[PDB]
Write a protein that binds this ligand. Structure first.
Ligand SMILES: CN(C)C(=O)c1cccc(O)c1
Ligand SMILES: [Zn+2]
Ligand SMILES: [Zn+2]
Ligand SMILES: [Zn+2]
Ligand SMILES: [Zn+2]
Lengths: 131, 285
């Protein structure tokens, strides 16, 4: 009974991060020890004519990005663990997330390490127009 | 190629919207085309779902610098025989809103302690994972009848994990700097450990210079077995599965080859006592 959500290539990393005190540090350390990034994300097909904003209601990739389903790029959603936000809710689940093509091999690691500018809506260091 | 880890146990016929699905596998077929997914104008997100996600199938085979191995060899376990705590869990099954996973019900230890938990699972929602009470029933059959009264005597998990840490600390503080859980067919015991174990690099006690065996979510602090009052998680435990040592039948038949003082009283603690007793007879007698 039931429907699978995961593939065996992700079992080790998800188990490690599901038990960690600090899941983000565990994922960073797993990668630094030679582990593969989490796969089986929700990658979208789009027109690559979007606004390029980081977190959007519909896919908004520009020609320098890819669009993904938001929950699938969130380590806390992927491991089914608590979110660090004060009220414990997610800012990615229920939205699409734009990720620079140069980083699209590891969308989960990208979202853990980067920050969205609250003024222009683009990733700091990857589109932010506020200097 | 799929795994049962994080299997969605809901009875919802359809998959999830692309923005809400944790994975490509979990996206509904309606959004899948040309090898990936599409957003479809006019198709809403689901804002009221509760999907039970299974914790059966963890794999602790990573090798990460500075993080100790959880599962240890028979030789390492023998050196730490004073840290051995037999551990067994009897589960109940998800029912009604979900089916297909086992939830911890009676947690038993070689100290003779049995702790009963409210049936609790990991329910994905549109905003988070809700660790919450779920509908459950004991497995049917006469061998499981004793679990029936336990369905209404459970304690919330926040109380159970504090009691586990206190019991382990009271037992081991003058015996070892660690715990080695002694298991027989470890899968469900490892699933149960998700509810009360955390891992990370080796740390020391907040209140003294000893190795940390406990963690507190209240303060993000670490304690040894002597200063862990009020601590809620077991930190960096070790474990070994005795069944992997070449035995062929059930636990009781192998235990009974060397021991006659532990009659089976059909309870999690008795299975935990038999498991540690079998390991001790195999390694030291
Ligand atoms: C994309 N989804 C699922 C929406 O809920 C939505 C929200 C705002 C505008 C819009 O066109 C669609
Ligand atoms: Zn999330
Ligand atoms: Zn900006
Ligand atoms: Zn201490
Ligand atoms: Zn015995």
């Amino acid at each position: 009974a039931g429907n699978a959500t995961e593939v065996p290539a992700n079992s080790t990393v998800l188990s490690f991060c599901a038990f960690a005190v600090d899941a983000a540090k565990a994922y960073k350390d797993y990668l630094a020890s030679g582990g593969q990034p989490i796969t089986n994300c929700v990658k979208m097909l789009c027109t690559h004519t979007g606004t390029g904003q980081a977190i959007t209601v519909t896919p908004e990739a520009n020609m320098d990005q890819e669009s993904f389903g938001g929950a699938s790029c969130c380590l806390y959603c992927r491991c089914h663990i608590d979110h660090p936000n004060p009220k414990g809710f997610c800012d990615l689940k229920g939205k699409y997330v734009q990720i620079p093509t140069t980083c699209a091999n590891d969308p989960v690691g990208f979202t853990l390490k980067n920050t969205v500018c609250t003024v222009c809506g683009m990733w700091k260091g990857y589109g932010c127009s506020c200097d | 190629n799929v795994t049962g880890l994080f299997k969605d146990c809901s009875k919802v016929i359809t998959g999830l919207h692309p923005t809400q699905a944790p994975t490509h596998l979990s996206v509904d077929t309606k959004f899948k085309t040309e090898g990936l997914c599409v957003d479809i104008p006019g198709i809403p997100k689901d804002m009221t779902y509760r999907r039970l996600i299974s914790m059966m199938g963890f794999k602790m085979n990573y090798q990460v610098n500075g993080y100790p191995n959880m599962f240890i060899t028979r030789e390492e376990a023998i050196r730490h025989v004073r840290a051995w705590i037999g551990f067994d869990v009897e589960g109940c099954h998800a029912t009604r809103e979900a089916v297909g996973t086992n939830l911890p019900l009676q947690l038993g230890f070689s100290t003779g302690v049995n702790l009963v938990a409210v049936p609790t699972g990991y329910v994905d929602t549109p905003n988070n994972t809700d660790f919450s009470r779920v509908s459950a029933k004991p497995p049917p059959g006469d061998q499981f009848k004793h679990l029936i009264p336990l369905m209404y005597k459970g304690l919330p998990w926040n109380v159970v994990r504090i009691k586990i840490v206190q019991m382990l600390s009271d037992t081991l503080k003058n015996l070892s700097d660690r715990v080695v859980f002694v298991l027989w067919a470890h899968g469900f015991e490892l699933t149960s450990m998700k509810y009360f174990v955390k891992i990370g690099p080796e740390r020391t006690c907040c209140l003294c210079d000893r190795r940390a065996t406990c963690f507190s979510t209240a303060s993000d602090t670490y304690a040894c077995w002597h200063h862990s009052i009020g601590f809620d998680y077991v930190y960096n435990p070790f474990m070994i599965d005795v069944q992997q040592w070449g035995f062929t039948g059930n636990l009781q038949s192998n235990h009974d080859l060397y021991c006659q003082v532990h009659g089976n009283a059909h309870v999690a603690s008795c299975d935990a006592i038999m498991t540690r007793c079998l390991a001790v007879h195999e390694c030291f007698v």
